[PDB]
Amino acid sequence: SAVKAARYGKDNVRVYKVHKDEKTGVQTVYEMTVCVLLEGEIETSYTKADNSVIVATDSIKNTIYITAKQNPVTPPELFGSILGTHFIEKYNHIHAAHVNIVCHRWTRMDIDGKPHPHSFIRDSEEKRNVQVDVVEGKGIDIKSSLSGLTVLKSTNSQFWGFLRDEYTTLKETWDRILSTDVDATWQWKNFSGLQEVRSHVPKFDATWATAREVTLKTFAEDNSASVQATMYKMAEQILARQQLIETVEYSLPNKHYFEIDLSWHKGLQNTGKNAEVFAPQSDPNGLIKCTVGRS
Template sequence: MSEVKAARYGKDNVRVYKVHKDEKTGVQTVVEMTVCVLLEGEIDTSYTKADNSVIVATDSIKNTIYILAKQHPVTPPELFGSILGTHFIEKYKHIHAAHAHIVTHRWARMDVDGKPHPHSFVRDSEEKRNVQVDVVEGQGIDISSSLSKLTVLKSTNSQFWGFLRDEYTTLKETWDRILSTDVDAAWQWKRFSGLDEVRSAVPQFDTTWSAAREITLKTFAEDNSASVQNTMYKMAEQILARQPLVETVDYSLPNKHYFEIDLSWHKDLQNTGKNAEVYAPQSDPNGLIKCSVGRSSKPKL
């Protein structure tokens, strides 16, 4: 005898572009997103009994995304994801949870002759702003915001020494190295009771995203890093201090290596240690460091 233990389905990779036109100033603002919506509920019979009557067609889910994008603001994405999820659990009585994942693709306004252009944009990096919104009937709305593909590098002020050494260790200690990574940072908001409470928090979403990005870049640049682990912890604790509605902060940082090249074989050309200028960027293998930082439950002494 078997049964469905868990099931969800929906529409993935829905590409959405929306433009806001300010008729008074002529300034336009664009948003491009990739949206995924998955539904849960009383849908087991569609799997076990071939009963399609409980299925909201994935094409209908796609159409709903477009219609709601027309009828409602799509920024901040935390709000739009909450609007999507709330719609599905209120529209269909047998759907009890809706999960929206939104990736916002970066478009930066062009500067032309030193002035922001009213309707022209440039994709200056592959950086993305992401949200995961989970709306569960009778429980509330859980939101995780994140930024990803923020590629950074600094040419000095990174160290790595004092690590465990044994018979498997060949890595040399260093007090000055290149540090580069693709930042993936996420912050989990406290649970919201419903859409109205999300709406009341709207000003917090953009400011917190901007603050998290600023903290990440500033700490990366200014910290004389003892390790990726220590630097990411400093980033996370600052975000928690900045936004009391955030419960946890997660970082995932691949350590993108740049290796010195020994060129002494060519006419004693010195290119290691303090003389290193030419490096070989490495694609793999790479270090991968992760952490989740939350508020301490220990009372202050």
């Protein structure tokens, strides 16, 4: 039998960093959860009990804290690239590093209509993530994403004209609620190395901001023919705004809100144009995905 693939490392490493401006006294915090998995010439640790090739996962954890202490942790695309590059340069037998970072929100509080210097609030569970794969001799591949962005529109969503056969009971509709949790990922063109990633630093935050803005505006303004149609419009726009992106992927659940027929009770009217009270459904849910690239 043989080892076809192997990777190992440390997951769920929580890190917080504070930056203090001695001038203004203003403080800014960053909190993330980091995972680093390594690959290389490590097969013998599995096959011959040879631990000599293993950089202990505890040491990988130490390295994450040390790297955060000596480098900026934002944007996460840069921090991930520095961290991944460290491992492949430091250890001759390690040839790839896979770094996943989830950034948690700590938004500056406004007290009395004005930004507080050192107090923050977690406004929603939405995350900004990055996946960075640093492979010796093959550069740096970065996928950036936003996830956990939950939205709902109460009208201006339709779903009619779908295939109807002997398995179909769903009625066509011209006015429904649409609600989803957005997961959007944009994949960057391959970078030759850290120097190239550093040269594009300003584009990272800007592109995340654009992806978020296009998602929200399109969802709110599109008179949606389907989740499929609306998501394609979002991806099209993002690709048009940033040339250094190769593909955009969206994965959207369709979280159903059902009408409740109350006519059995005193002829109460609560369906169609009279629908006011709905039952949110926890499961099942539609799941719609698409990856859009350049023609």
